[PDB]
Amino acid sequence: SIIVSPRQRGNPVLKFVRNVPWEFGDVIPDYVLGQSTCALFLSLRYHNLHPDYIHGRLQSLGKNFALRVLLVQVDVKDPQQALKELAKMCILADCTLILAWSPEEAGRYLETYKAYEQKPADLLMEKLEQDFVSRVTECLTTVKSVNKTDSQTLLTTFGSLEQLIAASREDLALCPGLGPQKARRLFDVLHEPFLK
Amino acid sequence: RIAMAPLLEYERQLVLELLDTDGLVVCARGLGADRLLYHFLQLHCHPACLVLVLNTQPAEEEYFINQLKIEGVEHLPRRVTNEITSNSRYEVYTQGGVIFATSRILVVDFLTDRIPSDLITGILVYRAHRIIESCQEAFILRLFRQKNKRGFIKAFTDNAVAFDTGFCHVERVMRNLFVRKLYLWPRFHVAVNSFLEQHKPEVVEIHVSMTPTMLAIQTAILDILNACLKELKCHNPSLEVEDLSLENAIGKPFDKTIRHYLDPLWHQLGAKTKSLVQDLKILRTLLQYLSQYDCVTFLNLLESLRATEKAFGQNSGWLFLDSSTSMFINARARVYHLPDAKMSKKEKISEKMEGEETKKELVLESNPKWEALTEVLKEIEAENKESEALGGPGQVLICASDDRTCSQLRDYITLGAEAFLLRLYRKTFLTIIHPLLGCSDPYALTRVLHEVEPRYVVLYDAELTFVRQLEIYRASRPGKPLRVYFLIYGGSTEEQRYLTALRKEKEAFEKLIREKASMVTQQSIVVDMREFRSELPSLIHRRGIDIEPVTLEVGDYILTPEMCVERKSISDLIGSLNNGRLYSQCISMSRYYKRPVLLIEFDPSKPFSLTSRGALFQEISSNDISSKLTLLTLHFPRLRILWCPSPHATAELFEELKQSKPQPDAATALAITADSETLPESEKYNPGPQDFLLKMPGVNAKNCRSLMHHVKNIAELAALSQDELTSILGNAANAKQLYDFIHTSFA
C-alpha cells in the first residue's frame, strides 16, 4: 500500500514499478512506504539546475518519520563533486543516501522497500553449519593457507581423522596438487604440544 | 675467503660509480647483484654511523650475518622485530650500526617520531621491484625526506622483467625512489664480457630424445590448455595484455599476472570463470608433474583426478575430464596390459570378456633421462680411473629441481632400475645430491658450492639463476675448469621454458638503454594498523591532517569523538553481505559509537549494476545485493552511507567532514576493545592447536581450556574412549558428539 504524493505526475519512475499497487494522497514527502519510511526522488541533473531545491525541502519534512530515505539517481558523467556536496548536506539532517545507477533499478528499490518487514534471515553466517562434511571443511581450513578444494582431496583419500592423525609426514606428502609446504604445515599443526 | 670476498675487476668499476652520485643499479639474473651489497655493508658498518636496509627476508640474514662474522668485524649487524617491547625498548638505533627491519615496524616508529631522524645517514633498499606498486615503502621514503642535507639513498636490485612490464614506466618508479641518475649494467656490456671470457667454463650440451609415447601426452595437454584459454578470453574482455598467448602460460610467473588482474572485483565474475581458473592451474601443474616424477605415481595422479566426481560432482570440472580420452589410453598403457583370450576359435577378440581370468600385466617403462645419465657417470669415473692418482680424486654434486626428485634419483642408483617398478607397483597395487630450488633459503646451494669444490658438475633441467652463478664461481683462475653437463629433452617443455625466458630477458634489458638515452590549529585521525596496506593514508597525510598508528577492533577510521568509518569496496560489500559478517559488525558499531557510517567506493568507468536486469524484469527481486542492502538499512535507522567515486576524493571528503568538531583522542580508544578471547600465554604453542580445537563439534571455551590443560596433544583424542572424555568433561551429549565426529568415515 505505497502512497505516491501528486507531485510525481510526469515522473519516469512510476512506470517502472510492477509489484504492489500505489495510491495518490496529500502527504508532504512524496513516496510513503507503509509506516515510518518516506522516500524522496532526485536526479542529479535537476540538482545542477535548481541548486536551492533539496536544502529547502529538507527543512519542511522535520522529524516526523523514524526512517527517512533520500534516493538519488546519477546520469551526469562528472559525479565527483555533487556527491561530495550531498553527503555533507545530508549528514547534518539525518537521512540515508541511496544511489541508483539506472531508472530500471528504481523499480527494484521501490518494490523492495515496500515488501520487506521480515525476520533477521541474514544474521547467522553459520546458516548451513549442521552437516558432517561442512564441519570437517570448516574445521580443517583454520590453518594458514589451505582452501576448501585441498580439504576435499584430503577427505577423499582417508576419510577418517583417526587415519589422518596417524599418517607419517611422507605418508601425508602424497598430496594431489597441494605442495610439500602445506603438508609440512598441517603435519606440524595436527601434532604439536600446547604448553611447555 | 668466503662468499663474494674479494670482488672481481668487473665489479670494481660499478662500486666506483655508486660511491659518488646516488642512483639505482640494474644488475642481471644473479650475476652477483647480492654480492655488491656485502661490500657496502662492511664499509658503513662502523659503530658510530647508521643506515637501514629496507626489504630483506629472514634467512638471508643468517648467511650474511655468519659470513661477515668469519672476517671478525665487531658490532656485527643487529636485527629488530615486532616482538621487541615496542617503544623505549628500541634503543638499539641510538647504539647504531647497520640495522635490519621489516616494512611495518618502521612506519610506526617514524610517525610517533621515536627514532632519531637527525642522525640517520642513509637508506639501502633491496628487491626494488616490490616498490613498483604504491605500498608501505613509498610512505617510509617520502617520510624520510626531511633529512634533506645528509641522507643518501641507494637501489641495489634485480629481476629486470618487472620494470619491463607495460604501464609501469621506470621514470615513475625512479621519481618515487627519490634518486636522480640510473646505472644499467647488463650481461652483454662491453667490459663485463671481456673479463668473463678470459676464464669461461665449458658446456657439454647433450640431447636426449624422448619416447614416442610421451608426445601423445604432451600434444594433448597443450591442446586442452589451448582450448581452455580461448574460453577464458571470450567471457572476460578486460584482461587482454601479457596473459594472452600460449608462450606465457607455460612459464612459472603466470599466476602473478592473474592475481594482479582479477583480485580487484573478484566477486563480480559469476560462476563460469571461477572454475575455469582452477582448471587452468591444475592443467599447468599436470605438465610439470609428468616429466619430473615416475610413471607409477603419475598413473595414480591421473586416476586420483577421476575420484572427485563420484562424491563431489564438478570438483575439477565436467568439461575436460569427459573429452579427449587419448590421455587415458596413453596413460593406461604404461602400467597395465590389455585383455587376452582364445581357444583355436575365429571371431574371438573382445573388450572385457573372459582364458581372460588373469589380470594382464604391462611392463613399466623408464623415461630416458635415467638411461642417458649413466653414460656420463661411467665415463667420468674412467676420467678419474684413467687419471688414477695423476688426475686427482674429484667430486660430483649432481643437482635436481625439487626434494622428491632427489629422493627418487637417490634410489634409482642405490637399489637398481627394476627395483622401483617392483617396489612402487607393490605399494599401490662422492655422489652428494642437493635440491636446486625452494621457498627455502636461496642462499644455500651457493654455501654447498664453496662447501665441496666440484671437479665435475651435472645439472638436471634448471633455471637461469643457477647457470650464471657458476661462471662467477669461476673466480679462481688456476683452479681446474669445472665441467658442467647440460641435459636437454629434444623439443620439449623445459627447453621451451628455458629458451623463451632467456629471450625474455634479452629484449627486456635492451628497451631500458633506449630509455636511459632519452632523458637528456591542526587535526588528527586515529588510524587502524591493518589499513596501512592501501594508498589512502598516503593521500591523507599530504593534506596536512596528522596520523597516529594503533590497533583497533571496531571500524577503520575514527574521524571525531562521535563517528566511526568502516571502509569497504564494491567487491568486499558483495562478499561481506553474503558471507554474513557486516551484520555482526554494525550491531557492535551502533552499540559502541554514536553515529556509524560506511564508505562505498564504486568506479566511474565500469558501474556494476548490482541487479540482474532480466530477473528484475521477471522475478520478485529476491536474493541479490540490492535486497540484502535494503534489508540491512531497514533495521538500523541510524546508519549513514557515504558513496565516493575514487580514493583521491576520500581525502577531500574527510577534511570537509571534520570542520568544527573536536579532535578524536588516542586515550582509551584502545581501551574500549571488546569482551572475549580469554588469555593467550596458556599454551607455549598457543597459536596452533587452539584454532583447530575450537572449531571441533562438542566444545566450549571452558571445557576446551580444561581438557587442553589436561591431555597433551591432538592425537589421543581419537585414541581415548568416549567414557574418558565424558568423565573429564562431565557432559554426555556433546561428548558423544565429539566421539561420533572423531570416529567416522565418508559415505
Author numbering:
A (entry chain G): 100 to 295
B (entry chain F): 9 to 362, 366 to 440, 551 to 641, 680 to 906
Provide text from the study:
XPF–ERCC1 recognises double-stranded/single-stranded (ds/ss) DNA junctions which have a 3′-ssDNA overhang, nicking the dsDNA backbone to produce a substrate for subsequent steps in DNA repair pathways. XPF–ERCC1 activity is essential for removing helical DNA distortions arising from ultraviolet-induced damage and bulky adducts as part of the nucleotide excision repair (NER) pathway. XPF is the enzymatically active subunit of the heterodimeric XPF–ERCC1 endonuclease and is comprised of a helicase-like module (HLM) and a catalytic module (CM). The smaller ERCC1 subunit has no catalytic activity but is structurally related to the XPF CM, consisting of a nuclease-like domain (NLD) and a dsDNA-binding (HhH)2 domain.
A single particle cryo-electron microscopy (cryo-EM) density map of purified recombinant XPF–ERCC1 complex (128 kDa) was determined at a global resolution of 4.0 Å enabling the assignment of XPF–ERCC1 domain organisation. Local resolution analysis indicated that the heterodimeric 2×(HhH)2 domain exhibited some mobility, so signal subtraction of this domain was carried out followed by local refinement. This process improved the global resolution of the resulting sub-volume to 3.6 Å which enabled building, refinement and validation of an atomic model. The cryo-EM structure of near full-length XPF–ERCC1 reveals a compact conformation with extensive interactions between the XPF HLM and CM modules. The two RecA-like domains form a rigid platform and lack a nucleotide cleft characteristic of many ATP-driven helicases. While RecA1 caps one edge of the HLM and engages the XPF nuclease domain in the CM, the helical domain caps the other HLM extremity and engages the CM and the dsDNA-binding ERCC1 (HhH)2 domain. The XPF helical domain forms a contact with the XPF nuclease domain that sterically prevents the ds/ssDNA substrate from reaching the XPF active site. A key contact within this auto-inhibited conformation is between sidechains of H275XPF and S730XPF. A second autoinhibitory interface exists between the XPF helical domain and the ERCC1 (HhH)2 domain. This interface is formed through predominantly polar contacts involving the highly conserved T248ERCC1, T252ERCC1 residues and both S312XPF and T316XPF. The structure of DNA-free XPF–ERCC1 reveals how the heterodimer is auto-inhibited by blocking both DNA binding and active site access through contacts with the XPF helical domain.
